[PDB]
Write a protein that binds this ligand. Sequence first.
Ligand code: BCL
Ligand code: BCL
Ligand code: BCL
Ligand code: BPH
Ligand code: LDA
Ligand code: LDA
Ligand code: LDA
Ligand code: LDA
Ligand code: FE2
Lengths: 301, 281, 246
Amino acid sequence: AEYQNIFSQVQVRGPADLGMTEDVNLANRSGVGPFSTLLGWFGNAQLGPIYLGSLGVLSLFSGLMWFFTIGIWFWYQAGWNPAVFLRDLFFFSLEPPAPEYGLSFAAPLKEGGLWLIASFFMFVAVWSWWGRTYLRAQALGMGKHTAWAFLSAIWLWMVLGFIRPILMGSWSEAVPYGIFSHLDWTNNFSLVHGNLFYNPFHGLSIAFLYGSALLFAMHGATILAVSRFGGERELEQIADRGTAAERAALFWRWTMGFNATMEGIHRWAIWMAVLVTLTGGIGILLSGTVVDNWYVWGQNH
Amino acid sequence: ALLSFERKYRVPGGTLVGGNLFDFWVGPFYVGFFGVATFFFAALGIILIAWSAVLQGTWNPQLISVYPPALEYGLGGAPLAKGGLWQIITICATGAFVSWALREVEICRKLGIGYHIPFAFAFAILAYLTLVLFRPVMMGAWGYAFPYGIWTHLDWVSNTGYTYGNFHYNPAHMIAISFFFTNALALALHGALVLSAANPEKGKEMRTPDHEDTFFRDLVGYSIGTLGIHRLGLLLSLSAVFFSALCMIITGTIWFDQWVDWWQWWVKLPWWANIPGGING
Amino acid sequence: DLASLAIYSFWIFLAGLIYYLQTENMREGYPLENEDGTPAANQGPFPLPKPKTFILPHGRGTLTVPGPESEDRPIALARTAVSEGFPHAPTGDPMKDGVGPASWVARRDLPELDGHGHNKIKPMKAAAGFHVSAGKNPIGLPVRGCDLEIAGKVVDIWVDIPEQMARFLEVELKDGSTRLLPMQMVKVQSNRVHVNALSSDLFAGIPTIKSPTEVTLLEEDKICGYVAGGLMYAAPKRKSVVAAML
Ligand code: BCL
Ligand code: BCL
Ligand code: BCL
Ligand SMILES: CC[C@H]1c2cc3[nH]c4c(c3C)C(=O)[C@H](C(=O)OC)c4c3nc(cc4[nH]c(cc(n2)[C@@H]1C)c(C(C)=O)c4C)[C@@H](C)[C@@H]3CCC(=O)OC/C=C(\C)CCC[C@H](C)CCC[C@H](C)CCCC(C)C
Ligand SMILES: CCCCCCCCCCCC[N+](C)(C)[O-]
Ligand SMILES: CCCCCCCCCCCC[N+](C)(C)[O-]
Ligand SMILES: CCCCCCCCCCCC[N+](C)(C)[O-]
Ligand SMILES: CCCCCCCCCCCC[N+](C)(C)[O-]
Ligand SMILES: [Fe+2]
């Protein structure tokens, strides 16, 4: 019938691409990994190379340590028994210091201290990776757009596990490391703050989360609809507009009265998605510090 | 009013219904048979919402709320002010949405492009229709659907959620959330990558795809490519809505209790089921 | 109350951001024109952004947007009604004249370059080390048009080297010359490549490339424009779903 260009018909492969050099310290780049024919049906088949400077090494070490602190506690909670570990994996939880400890680091290892060490490791890992998104762009002379977008995601994480606890005077206010328990905490947080559906910023965050899936459904579909004119080669279409960019713009103008440009739709994209965690972060930061009950706040409004 | 390059595309043809009769534009908007069908269904649905507002005794945006037929009616008709009006507005809504998708198909036909956007929109229409048609019919009553009101549909989400405990424990809801979160992540990243290359450090030459691939290769050791990221985006957002629709159409039809209890099937598995320790022993 | 100040400030910001984003998306296509090229009186509530300039690599110049419209080629379409808002009909052959779904834009008549300043798309013959790694290899298959008549045979795959993907199939015609068919417009089957957009008789009219070893963005746009235009204009010769699944 027609070809929808969702999965490739024929794969083609050539010599591994080592990348652009620009000001990247090449000594810090690994070799090429394998090529996967599976991935190649949907995207590029090549795996690697990866850059691993000192910052990449620190991020991986602290992140593996974050995983290890959580892992060892889970194994302890499982009585070191493999079968118990596997049946209750989603049920285990590394919990914060109890309220009485406030913000001190004097909590016993099994009762808060292990959580503190895990949080330290995740803090270092995430901020190291943030530095790395900045510096890899810098070495290639690119704008710092990824690092700034990553800062919005980091805002929510920072508010949830560090900034709002510190402002509230207690580590018990932060999230546990566990699959079901972080879900329980999320539910409990709404209950305690008088139903988060009345928080104006949670409503906005939701609007931007739904908005992100509306807009990537729209953008992805538009590009594959004009991939028959090389539409996915967006940077040359920005540099020298072709019929793919014109027909893409005119579908939406004829459908809903206004449209984007091949460069401009990526600004709508980064902002739609960034605003999810930006509004979300403000929403959580105000909860408990300024507003104790959002239903009540909603009444005086 | 046309864009600088638009005239050459405004040709005849592409209409699915009624030949050239509705083949024209009002300002930027294309009309077509499905353009007038969306205007009819949208207008009648809005007039019926205004009439439900009149009957409810309010004109306030925040307070207007059209409710489904209360459970006694099952899947039968209802008096207009007690659920009948919802039923008609639902017909109008389905009609306006399907017409919007079919209008998009006529615009695709005139522009010679693929039908990917109407196809993707159909998933959101099917999600709406799961909550309003498929799950109510499978459950035996229209009252299980949501109210058409800004704050009241949220009340519906909350009550429906809590009938099954913390709705987070629904496994298909978990998958749906994962796709929404990953979709927003990917969107941020794609926007950021095309923009970092098109707008390099001040004074440098515009970067190329190769630089996008090398940035992501240096950062995470893979680059899905420019075709792949758009393929991925469409798939993440569509899978998010599919699993949303799935998590609801199973709730109330084949699962009736607290969703947290589902997870016990894995715990009660014979070989580890009775070992003391952990969280469940 | 702090939360009250916060949400008020947010809506102010958001109004500002949407103004920025929409003006930003007016760098192409604006000013708006009436159906005869004159400036339209109603330009809407957003002004044109101040210019930005892209420095294009390897001696390709600069692009400053917003700017004067680059399209100056004749558009072969007659007005159909005196009133604004109606179709403009093809005066000649729409496929050949490059209008409607067969439109093309006068893009730069140089090949797209990779990051290293080399041609991005190359015939696989010349792309050293490139080979079909999975899927039915189309080279050698007959190419069948929508009228279910054979139009040629695939003599090569043109490859995007940096993305490692098939972009075009080079098809040899009955007179021995070749044409490029966009990969995303063909169906590679087990014994045939089928092109739904074009009947066999239309394959000779596909825009040609000048050099046997490279394609320019201008050529690509004319090839892709022509081929997609076939979905509307070749529809008389397109045999039914019935006729083809027999
Ligand atoms: C998906 C699960 C639930 C649900 C759960 C929630 C939750 C939870 C929240 C919302 C919120 C919203 N919901 Mg809801 N909502 C549902 C189904 C719908 C339907 C529908 C036809 O199916 C519609 C139109 C809406 C519409 C809305 C918006 C008014 C609001 C912001 C959403 C958004 O930005 O989307 C993204 C889309 C865009 C960015 C495109 C722009 C669309 C605009 C904003 C839609 C306006 C709708 C309009 C007022 C409806 C009347 C139409 C006619 C004029 C009569 N919901 C289903 C039943 N909805 C949020 C809120 O703040 O509510 C008070 C919120 O927190
Ligand atoms: C009963 C529970 C409550 C509720 C309680 C909460 C609470 C509590 C919170 C939210 C939040 C959110 N809620 Mg809610 N919410 C409810 C009902 C809803 C409904 C609905 C009914 O349909 C919807 C659509 C939403 C939607 C949302 C989102 C808009 C928002 C989360 C954004 C996000 O992307 O975070 C995901 C993004 C992150 C978590 C950022 C992560 C970034 C870091 C840096 C990643 C580190 C990774 C790490 C190192 C490990 C991996 C590395 C490997 C190499 C892979 N809620 C009900 C009423 N909701 C959050 C919010 O922002 O508030 C507004 C929030 O805190
Ligand atoms: C307290 C309540 C429970 C809970 C109860 C429910 C319930 C109940 C439902 C969900 C649903 C959802 N929940 Mg939940 N959920 C909870 C907590 C969460 C959290 C969180 C972080 O805590 C998250 C991330 C989520 C996430 C999700 C999403 C996966 C899903 C909503 C998207 C969707 O269906 O889109 C689908 C998209 C649509 C329905 C939109 C259709 C739009 C139509 C086609 C067009 C509209 C056009 C418009 C009228 C035109 C406007 C014109 C204007 C002029 C612009 N939930 C809590 C624990 N959740 C919903 C679901 O799965 O739905 C199927 C659902 O019903
Ligand atoms: C399938 C995946 C995602 C997606 C995709 C998507 N949406 C799409 C498309 C796509 C690909 C379009 O092409 C189409 C579009 O043109 O976008 C600009 C659209 C669209 N997605 C929209 C909204 C939307 N999409 C949503 C979600 C999603 N859309 C998913 C996240 C949501 C929510 C809440 O998450 C909303 C609000 C519309 C803006 C637009 C379709 C426009 C359209 O069909 O409108 C014609 C209708 C009218 C002019 C008015 C009719 C009014 C009725 C008669 C009354 C209706 C009342 C209603 C039933 C209740 C309202 C009250 C609520 C508070 C409950
Ligand atoms: C996410 C990667 C999973 C990809 C699996 C999909 C494989 C598609 C295989 C069909 C091969 C293409 N075809 C039919 C034209 O030969
Ligand atoms: C408080 C958290 C800070 C998050 C703010 C993040 C803004 C990201 C903006 C993306 C657009 C800006 N820019 C320069 C990168 O293009
Ligand atoms: C084997 C370890 C798997 C457990 C990983 C735990 C994921 C839940 C993470 C929630 C953490 C939230 N946070 C960062 C803000 O504290
Ligand atoms: C940053 C994303 C903001 C999400 C809200 C989307 C608003 C779309 C507004 C359309 C305004 C453009 N306009 C006036 C020309 O139609
Ligand atoms: Fe894009």
